[PDB]
Ligand binder design. Structure first.
Ligand SMILES: N#Cc1ccccc1O
Ligand SMILES: N#Cc1ccccc1O
Ligand SMILES: N#Cc1ccccc1O
Ligand SMILES: N#Cc1ccccc1O
Lengths: 263, 264
């Protein structure tokens, strides 16, 4: 991978692996989400990091608030997918990281994604919002003119998501993380939550449709000893409303929506 | 990746990813097992496949009976690991696939692995000794002189594993696969079973030790609707454990194994 000519975005190519594909022999949306995370980390490394020494001193970290992914064509097993990523500050609110996925052979855009990140104290888990001196440190690595993977005014990535009301149409109960679901800091990987959302989609949908769009809000983290229930109701192409909540008290951890196109 | 000069082994390099590492910022044993599977798959593709046209006609597949991995140094996040793999027939019993892992910078061997595979009818699940006509088709892609990743006299890779007796010292109950644990044929990925074995190792061991050796026997498959219990008992500067995976209800065995850990 490498920073582009202007040093304001980063590109990396990936060969889709045999264990990374589903039954149609194309990459799963979780493999795609793992690759977006990987190119995001390689971008942060290439420019000196994604916390600055200032954030590290204040015990401040970046945390995902929302992930939105739209795929037109999933890369097949053995195909090379090229991914370009960049960041942009959105004022005191937080920062956005965008991605563009392309077929390396044709050069056509096969997917796009956008995420919203907020600053949080690592210990108290309190938000606080982006400070003046911290922001300045990041500004030099972001384009100043708006560069959006989803430019359209009031598009799918910015839509408010409602809370699913019981009884849910479908559910997968008692989902628990294992060591492979944790990251290097022993926290559940953000991609695991996407997998848990998808657990309550009926197999008949998975067999006859392809996932086109997924939007997922992150409200609270699932700890190593937590148990999750994944709820799904049809709201319609097929569209679904999703809710992840901790098995006991029913505390919400995530809410989202999915849009599926008939194969 | 590419077949070597003699066309009898295959090499591929991998850059360790950020989500592939544990708390030490080095690759997990499950990341390593996934990479061995990937280089095995790329080797089969580079030579025409890992079923031959005759096996597909007969509804015959290769299935793993045993996996044995020994790691000296786990590659760090960002490091390039080079893996060489080859196959050898072991008569009518079945075939063996071996791997050698190396640090791409130093050229030193950082790990090695060996696996035993048997032929099985895909539908009846019945095992069979490898026939001559099928065997002959594979022989041209394997070295004829023995090439072993574990040459040693009574090496760890060939040791018989006993059945853990209740009560187990440690256990992780109610483990279930999710869609990410399945392969392209909707079967639980062989690496998931390694993860499930490791689930019952106490966190204190994981924090103070590094996994050196894991040997795992595969007896039966966990289906999509099955639930698994992972049992572990200490059998021992080094810690050794006996492992058992069994289906949560009736207690039917799916896997047995052993692990050896060295103090960090
Ligand atoms: N904000 C921000 C940012 C920009 C370039 C690379 C890494 C980052 O976290
Ligand atoms: N997640 C998780 C986890 C952590 C330590 C032991 C077992 C687990 O499933
Ligand atoms: N047996 C065997 C074998 C050898 C080279 C590549 C793939 C194989 O299944
Ligand atoms: N394993 C598995 C699985 C298959 C279909 C739906 C949900 C699942 O966890």
């Amino acid at each position: 991978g490498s920073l582009t000519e202007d040093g304001l975005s980063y590109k990396e190519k990936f060969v889709v692996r045999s264990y990374e594909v589903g039954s149609n022999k194309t990459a799963t949306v979780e493999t795609i989400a793992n690759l977006l995370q990987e190119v995001g980390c390689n971008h942060a490394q290439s420019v000196g990091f994604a916390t600055t020494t200032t954030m590290r001193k204040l015990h401040l970290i970046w945390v995902t608030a929302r992930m939105h992914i739209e795929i037109y064509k999933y890369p097949a097993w053995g195909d090379v997918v090229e991914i370009e990523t960049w960041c942009q500050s959105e004022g005191r609110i937080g920062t956005r990281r965008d991605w563009i996925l392309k077929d390396s052979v044709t050069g056509e855009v096969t997917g796009r994604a956008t995420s919203k990140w907020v600053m949080m104290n690592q210990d108290t888990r309190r938000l606080q919002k982006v400070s003046d001196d911290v922001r300045d440190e990041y500004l030099v690595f972001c384009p100043q003119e708006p560069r959006l993977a989803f430019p359209e005014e009031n598009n799918r990535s910015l839509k408010k998501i409602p809370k699913l009301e019981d009884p849910a149409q479908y559910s997968m109960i008692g989902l628990k993380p294992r060591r492979a679901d944790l990251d290097m800091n022993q926290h559940v990987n953000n991609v695991t939550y996407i997998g848990w959302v998808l657990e309550s989609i009926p197999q008949e949908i998975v067999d006859t449709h392809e996932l086109q769009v997924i939007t997922l809000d992150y409200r609270r983290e699932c700890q190593q000893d937590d148990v999750v229930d994944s709820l799904t109701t049809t709201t319609s192409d097929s569209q679904f409303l999703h809710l992840l909540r901790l098995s006991g008290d029913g505390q919400e951890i995530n809410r989202g929506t999915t849009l599926w196109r008939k194969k």
